[PDB]
Amino acid sequence: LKVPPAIAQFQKTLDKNTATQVFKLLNKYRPETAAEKKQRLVAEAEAVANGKVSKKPYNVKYGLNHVVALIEAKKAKLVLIASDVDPIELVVFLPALCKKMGVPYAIVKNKARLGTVIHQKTAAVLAVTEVREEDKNELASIVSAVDANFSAKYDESRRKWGGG
Amino acid sequence: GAYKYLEELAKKKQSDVNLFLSRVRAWEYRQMNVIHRASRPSRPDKARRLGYKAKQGYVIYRIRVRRGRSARCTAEERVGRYCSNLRVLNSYWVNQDATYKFFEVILVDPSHKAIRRDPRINWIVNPVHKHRESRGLTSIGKKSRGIGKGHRFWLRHNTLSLRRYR
Amino acid sequence: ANPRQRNKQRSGKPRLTRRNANKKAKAKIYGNFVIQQNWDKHATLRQNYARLGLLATPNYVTGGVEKLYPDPTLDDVLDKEISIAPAKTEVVRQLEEEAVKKAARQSNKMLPLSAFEHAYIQRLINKYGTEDFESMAKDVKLNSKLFNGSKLKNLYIRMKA
Amino acid sequence: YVKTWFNQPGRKLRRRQARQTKAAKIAPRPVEAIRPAVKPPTIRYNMKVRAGRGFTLEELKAAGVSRRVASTIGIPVDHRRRNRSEESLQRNVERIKVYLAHLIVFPRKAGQPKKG
Amino acid sequence: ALKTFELRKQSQENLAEQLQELRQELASLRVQKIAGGSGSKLSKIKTTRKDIARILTVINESNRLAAREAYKNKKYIPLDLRQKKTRAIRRALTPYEQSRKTLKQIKKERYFPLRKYALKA
RNA sequence: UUGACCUCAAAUCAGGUAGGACUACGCGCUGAACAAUAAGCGCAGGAAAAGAAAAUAACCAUGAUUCCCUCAGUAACGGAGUGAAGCGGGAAAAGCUCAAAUUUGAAAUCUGGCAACAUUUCUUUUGUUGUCCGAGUUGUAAUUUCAA
RNA sequence: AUUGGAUAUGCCAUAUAAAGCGCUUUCGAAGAGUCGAGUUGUUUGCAGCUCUAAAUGGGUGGUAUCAUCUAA
RNA sequence: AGAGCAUAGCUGUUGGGACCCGAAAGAUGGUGAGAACCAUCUAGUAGCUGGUUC
RNA sequence: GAAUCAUCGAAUCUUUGAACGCACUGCGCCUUAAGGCAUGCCUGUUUGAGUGUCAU
């Protein structure tokens, strides 16, 4: 058969170098593990029990409904889409929605890496909305690299019927 | 939410994306068995809105029935017989081709403790719901037997009621 | 006649007799103790409700009642107030007296502040005055929970009592 | 197929016992809920006043009873019916208010935690 | 005959050869009776048969009680130790999960329960 | 080489469940002669089914379902015959749960193992607490169901 | 001897919580091989087949615009 | 210047198996081995035959 | 403690039969005479395989 452009765009994924830099920033913003969250909460519980102000947590954003919501609200700075979502319809609209909202986006290879970042078996999509002030330059550099290696590159095959 | 996009995309039933996927998936589904377990629903929006929750005790089974009685009703009864320990919750069309119509049935395990402890699906555990698909108590079964409200949709007339003082 | 019923007839085993046949018997009252004490186990439920001064139905009756003896403008409805109604019988007076005495006993509806609530409102009062609650809520550092003016007012009121 | 009525006296007694069994469970409160007064929907009967299903949300709001507590004190709620005329509103608000004038509502116990 | 109440007051392995001795006694008496016996002979057959039945009852009851004690407060126990009311009764929802409610239903009944009231005539 | 994930497997692995019988009364798929009947087939319960309006009406409007009386042997269909329903009067009355909007300042959710603690129509039944693993972000909780 | 719903009275109560009713210079998502159209049967319903939607839209009525309802 | 309504009895009449009895249909579901046999619809029937009580 | 007695919460209940190790009483297997050994399906556990995708 002939692959439609909306599905054929998932065959062209982010290259080796830029994906490596992407997951390096992401691994600094992994969500708190179930174990780590439990230790922090019981520590506050001991403080409450004995005798008793924090900051807003920073982490990557995951979940399909959550990330699509963040894109629609323009809160996302970078959206990374798994290239092998088994029913492709869950993400087939995501590149176009990221284009409509002007959100930088990339299609990274496989969903196991995305799930590993968030301590799950599988993540169809990840989004970065907020970074610490020291990581503003790193995120800005990756956004330029994603644009130059994924958006500036291709942008013509994603309109063409692939496969066949 | 991303289910508004999936529900809207499912209306374009033979657009370029939907026709290609239906053709591809029909080829795969014909390779597997007639009734085979589905690891996850192919239409996570449609299964979700028909009562399915991604938790233990919820089972998705795919089936193909030859075209040419209702096809959806036939899919429900055959799948319900296939896994007789489960309760058929609902069903939905997922694909079709020249020869077959493909459906997925949502089944619920009434012995799992995640089902028996959920008050929202607790009702299916009661024995009055044994083989609902065989008595026409599913959505397609109710539609098939003209159950509904309005003017659009015998024994008490054929009788002769004879009161004591008459 | 049925083979099952013939089977148990031919057996030397006794039948599982149960004796539950007594009509004309009316259900005994549980629930309210005052009603049970004053209930008449022979009279019907209508006769008992009428004797006790209660209403068995707030609507019409769908037949003829028993006669044992030969008896001898929107503004002024949505705004009028009716001062209850008299208690005809003694039984209703016991029910009314019991209700008011229990409501008076279980009337403490004022919540005293806890250790955290007391400290939370104290830090806000000792900095933003006493009469200005809108400025108290708009503070971000001291009012970390982001309570609105109404909740801070309630914390003040509960602190007083 | 002939439907006989030999159980007509038996059904009369069985329903009476259900009324008494219900009254045994709920001792001091009426065995029926208060029904509104409505008008039958035709030119043949629209001059008659009969009993409705429940009181409209606008009737309950005017009488001072919220829809969440109306059912708890035996006042049925009809979300379907509406007051197209000011007469139906006044006829059934007064019915509710007279009902509340004759009502003894027994208090309930509440859990009050020791701390704040 | 034997008394059941003081039979339970004996050790388990004592009941073993008492059953053994009783069984040979019944077999020997049957051999005697088939060659000619009086009407009393079948009378002690009846008593020794019930005595063996009483003996085996104590052994099985003692073994069953021991199994129950050994499996007390264990998640899974053998089927013979489990309840036997009715197949449907075993499949039914337990009262705990029958009474499970959502947090939506808990709040409704916490704030708006069915009140107790009365209507004055 | 190793690991993550997916897929296909296997196991006398652990824990469960289905079949068959009875069917007077349920509900289905069918189906002759002469009736939407008999028979055939499938599936239940103490009742079943139905059920909180994609319902009526044309009024001063009614208000889930079911059943009874009436409508009415009427309208309609087709002369014969078939034959309802709205209203009206009674019996009983009870209402609700989700999908679709980000918890995003924190998967707040759940099964199982193990270990204690209780509890029992009950040493036979039910849970609770702790810990570990698993499920789950391709979405489990709270919140919302248009009456809002 | 078993158990129902209550009552009364202790002991705990994770309330930094959770609700109803006021107000709005802020919002308000609503189920698709389904509705529907054409054609064949069974009996308007149901089903097969070909095609296949909409958002003040859609269904059903009285108009011959209004009323009523909110399906999959 | 209304004469009807209700109940009961009688008689006639129209339906129900319809005064009783008497010819095989046909169909459905089985048994045995085209034909045969069994059980239900089904009180499917005789324009008639015979009988029908002080 | 009689009972060809009543009640009845504990035990026992041959071979079959939905009938279940395979035939239909034989013929078997494994483990320690006993325990067992049917099929489908659901949740989990464990052991594997894959030229599956990726990371080192």
Q: Where are the domains of chain E?
A: 1-75, 76-121
* Nearest Cα to Cα of residue B111 among E92, E81, E78, E98: E92
CB pairs under 8 A between C and D: 107
Positions 81-140 in B, CB within 7 angstroms of strand G:
92-93, 96, 98, 101, 139-140
C-alpha count within 13 angstroms, C-beta hemisphere, residue B156:
0
- Closest CA-bearing residue to C1' of F19: B84
Distance B79 CA to F43 C1' (A): 15
Alpha carbon distance B118, E100 (integer Å)? 7
Distance D13 CA to F136 C1' (A): 57
From the list C32, C96, C111, which residue is nearest D116 (CB)? Answer: C111
Cross-chain Cβ contact E118/D74 below 8 Å = no
| A25 in Cβ contact with A108 (< 8 Å) | no
User: Is C44 in CB contact (< 8 Å) with chain D?
Assistant: yes
Mind spelling out the 3-state secondary structure of chain D? Answer: CEEECCCHHHHHHHHHHHHHHHHHHCCCCCCCCCCCEECCCCCCCCCCCEECCCECHHHHHHHCCCHHHHHHHCCCECCCCCCCCHHHHHHHHHHHHHHHHCEEEECCCCCCCCCC
Rounded to the nearest 10°, the torsion over CA B20, B26, B31, B32 is 120
| D59 in Cβ contact with D92 (< 8 Å) | yes
B31 Cβ nearer than 7 Å to chain F strand = no
Burial class (CB in 10 A: 0-12, 13-18, 19+), A97: middle
| B30 in Cβ contact with B100 (< 8 Å) | yes
Alpha carbon distance A75, A67 (integer Å)? 9
Alpha carbon distance A142, A148 (integer Å)? 10
From the list B155, B162, B164, which residue is nearest D2 (CB)? Answer: B162
| Per-residue CA distances from D90 to C78, D55, D102, E45 (Å) | 7, 12, 19, 93
Q: Within a 10 A sphere around the Cβ of A33, how many other Cβ atoms?
A: 11
Is it the case that chain C and chain B have 3 or more CB pairs lying under 8 Å apart?
no
Measured in residues, chain B has a length of: 166
What are the residues facing D104 on neighbouring strands?
Answer: E118
Distance C105 CA to F107 C1' (A): 44
Alpha carbon distance D23, D17 (integer Å)? 10
Distance C31 CA to G6 C1' (A): 5
Measured in residues, chain A has a length of: 164
Alpha carbon distance D67, D70 (integer Å)? 5
| A55 in Cβ contact with A82 (< 8 Å) | no
Domains of chain B: 2-158 (3.40.1120.10)
C-alpha count within 13 angstroms, C-beta hemisphere, residue B145:
11
According to DSSP, the β-strands at B100-108 and B87-96 are antiparallel
Helix, strand or coil for residue C156? Answer: helix
Burial class (CB in 10 A: 0-12, 13-18, 19+), B63: buried
Resolution in A: 3.0
Distance D96 CA to F91 C1' (A): 25
Is it the case that chain D and chain A have 3 or more CB pairs lying under 8 Å apart?
no
What are the residues facing B64 on neighbouring strands?
Answer: B102
Q: Within a 10 A sphere around the Cβ of B10, how many other Cβ atoms?
A: 15
Which of chain B's residues have a Cβ under 8 Å away from the Cβ of E93? 116, 122, 125-126
Alpha carbon distance A79, A69 (integer Å)? 12
| A129 in Cβ contact with A77 (< 8 Å) | yes
A89 Cβ nearer than 7 Å to chain F strand = no
According to DSSP, the β-strands at B87-96 and B35-38 are unpaired
Residue A9 CA to its chain's centroid (Å): 17
Alpha carbon distance B91, B103 (integer Å)? 7
Q: How was this structure determined?
A: cryo-EM
Alpha carbon distance A92, A6 (integer Å)? 6
Q: Helix, strand, coil proportions of chain E in percent (round to 5)?
A: 65, 5, 35
| C99 in Cβ contact with D104 (< 8 Å) | yes
Among all residues of chain B, which has the CA nearest to that of A124?
B2
* Nearest Cα to Cα of residue D108 among B135, E114, C52: E114
| C161 in Cβ contact with C112 (< 8 Å) | yes
The shortest C-alpha distance from B150 to chain D (Å) reads 17
D contact residues 92-111, partner C, Cβ 8 Å cutoff? 93-94, 97-99, 101-102, 104-107, 109-110
Q: Within a 10 A sphere around the Cβ of C7, how many other Cβ atoms?
A: 9
CA angle D42, D48, D49 (to 5 degrees): 110
User: Is E88 in CB contact (< 8 Å) with chain B?
Assistant: yes
Residue C66 CA to its chain's centroid (Å): 32
The shortest C-alpha distance from B41 to chain D (Å) reads 38
Among all residues of chain E, which has the CA nearest to that of D32?
E119
User: Encoding tokens for residue D38?
Assistant: 């409505």
Of all helices (H) and strands (E), which one includes residue A125? strand A125-128
Burial profile A53-81: b = 16 or more Cβ within 10 angstroms, e = fewer: eeeeeebbbbbbeebbbbbbeeebbbbbb
DSSP B131-153: TGGGTT-SHHHHHHTT--SSS--
Which of chain C's residues have a Cβ under 8 Å away from the Cβ of D31? 45, 56-57
Q: Within a 10 A sphere around the Cβ of C147, how many other Cβ atoms?
A: 18
From the list C32, C58, C86, which residue is nearest E119 (CB)? Answer: C58
